[PDB]
Design a protein around this ligand. Structure first.
Ligand code: DBH
Ligand code: MN
Ligand code: MN
Length: 179
């Protein structure tokens, strides 16, 4: 699974996933499902940020925590928008809201609800993707056009097939359940 992650995602994503795990005391070589999952989440965040007009999104995910918070604070202080309790992934300059992006191996609505009650925000938009083509967003406002979301769904499905074809998919699907 480790080698699969390293040849499936680009070096930059891999490097950001390694950092993120080291910060939390996890080992990429041992917890290889969480490694893959983190790479996946990062990829989706970047595709998503790319999905609109070329400067629509402040990218929050992938940065160092302290700089992420600094950027978050600048947005709040300049837009008025309320300050999130947890680090979101993106800010949408067009719609004036932060976005939390989720990717689940379980049901979209389950994840959506866990994520919603964790953040406690009538402002932060939530957008969940699955490895089965499903998506759920706050007030069914999917932010992006169809094409951009579709591209993401396809990519996710390819990752699932690529894993499946190596027999790593079951272990990966179950592991989000074990957490
Ligand atoms: O920001 C995170 O750390 C995070 C952790 C787990 C799942 C996520 O979607 C995240 O954005
Ligand atoms: Mn995040
Ligand atoms: Mn997220």
């Amino acid at each position: 699974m480790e080698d699969f992650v390293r040849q499936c995602f680009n070096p930059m994503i891999v490097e950001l996933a390694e950092k993120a795990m080291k910060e939390y005391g996890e080992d990429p070589k041992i917890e290889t499902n969480k490694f893959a999952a983190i790479c996946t989440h990062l990829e989706v965040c970047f595709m998503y940020s790319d999905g609109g007009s070329k400067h629509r999104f402040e990218i929050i995910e992938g940065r160092d925590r302290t700089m992420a918070w600094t950027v978050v604070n600048s947005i709040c202080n300049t837009t008025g928008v309320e300050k999130p309790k947890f680090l979101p992934d993106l800010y949408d300059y067009k719609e004036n809201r932060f976005i939390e992006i989720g990717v689940t191996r379980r049901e979209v609505h389950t994840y959506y609800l866990e994520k919603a009650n964790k953040i406690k925000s009538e402002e932060t938009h939530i957008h969940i993707f699955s490895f089965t083509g499903e998506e759920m967003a706050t007030k069914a406002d999917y932010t992006l056009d169809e094409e951009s979301r579709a591209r993401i769904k396809t990519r996710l499905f390819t990752i699932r097939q690529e894993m499946a074809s190596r027999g790593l998919w079951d272990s990966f699907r179950q592991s989000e359940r074990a957490a």
